[PDB]
Amino acid sequence: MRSYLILRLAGPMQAWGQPTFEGTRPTGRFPTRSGLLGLLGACLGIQRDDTSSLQALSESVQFAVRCDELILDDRRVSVTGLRDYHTVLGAREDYRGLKSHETIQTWREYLCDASFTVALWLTPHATMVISELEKAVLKPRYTPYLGRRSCPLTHPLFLGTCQASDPQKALLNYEPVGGDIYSEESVTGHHLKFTARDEPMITLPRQFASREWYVIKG
Template identity: 30%
Template sequence: MTHVLLIRLAGPLQSWGTASRFPARRDSHSRPTKSAVIGMCAAALGLPRTMGLKQPDSRADDKDQAKLTVLGELARSLFGVRADHPGVPVRDYHTVGAGTYPLRPRDLITDHRRAAAVTASLDAATGDRFGHHTLTGWYGAPKKIATDPHSGVLVSGELARSALITERWYLADATFLVGLQHDDEALLQSVARALEHPQHLLWLGRKSCPPSGTLALKTVPGDLNTTFHNHRLLPGPDGTADPARKPWAWLQATPSQHGATSVQDQPVSFDALQPEHTTRWEVRSRVTISPNALDWEDIIP
């Protein structure tokens, strides 16, 4: 018999990516991806990001084998999303780097190149305080870190940085009901406990988007389709939900199922440097909430 773990994903901002990590335009998917949700569950359980989903190494110890088994079972679960409150797309015009760099005394002590560049400003300074000295166009996150041959300290090999301008999209005030269907009820219950007491920080797609309120709602017997029909809409940001509305839902399917479309979010590896995903299939449909649908209790907004 299968069971479904219901997860509430809500917050001021969410952003679910399905494309490149660092393009000039960072779009947000219209809904949470399976890879992101499985990654969130793995983080809550304390599983390391370097752990892949491929066949475990025969040399791995029993503890690592057990972790691989849990992660593999999570990835094998069927995934569904119901958009109770789809949210509103918002755009962030984001700039990083360039501009004027205010210097501190340690910047001159540890990097002779900066000291040489502001020699005139330092010579003109008066008084017993360090004063205000700036460099134009040298501001930016350190890149190409290496040991400086003159001072022996670690310095950036790339001082001048052009402004990096990106366009980033988010979903504002969205609330999603996510379901993970699996035949191992104990596994789903362990994930539910971990989501409420996570071992690592959790976020809704990006680190700037923390979740709000209750995450793990309940574990119920049945399948995704029935479960979505038998539970009322989650309250929105204002604490209400229109009982007559028919939300969209996306349920994991087989490639041969009528209306199935592909999405590239089936996780293979969560390695930060080389994440891997493969194709998954899903169908979209409107959900008619049952007149006898179950209400939600004890949800922290």
């Protein structure tokens, strides 16, 4: 009924953010909407000031994220976390001019042993088409990463392309099956939702608005 694009986000370390104005940079357990929009953005070489392109992207695309557990030699490996005592010396003291602090400190959280399968699709008011997105994910223009730039991908961003009625149905065709799914679209049997502050307010730089995921447990 609808055509989906299927991506895999997998690497030794990932980081998907939560509200902070502080030096500790938190992570949640799966990709944020903002972040996925950012990933696609990087693929479609969109500069940071290009509010038109950013808005087009945001209004065109929607995501569903599945949390894939890792299995090594027939054993399950749970997603764990990591805190990096991250230091900066010679950091700007102010936005104007060149005075700087001897040392500042930050704490940054990462996800270890995490892997995701993402399904994205187009909205009825789409400015784009899926062929574009596929081409981009296969040949990105800006460097693609998993949250932070220090976080490479260990598997091609492109997984596949297909067609179904649910996101759930779409994702069924792609191993590993069995993980939880967080979708921007409702799936009939399922009633639980999960609140986040993912949604980028493109008109207002680096500020995010509340939204809700639909949860499809496995």
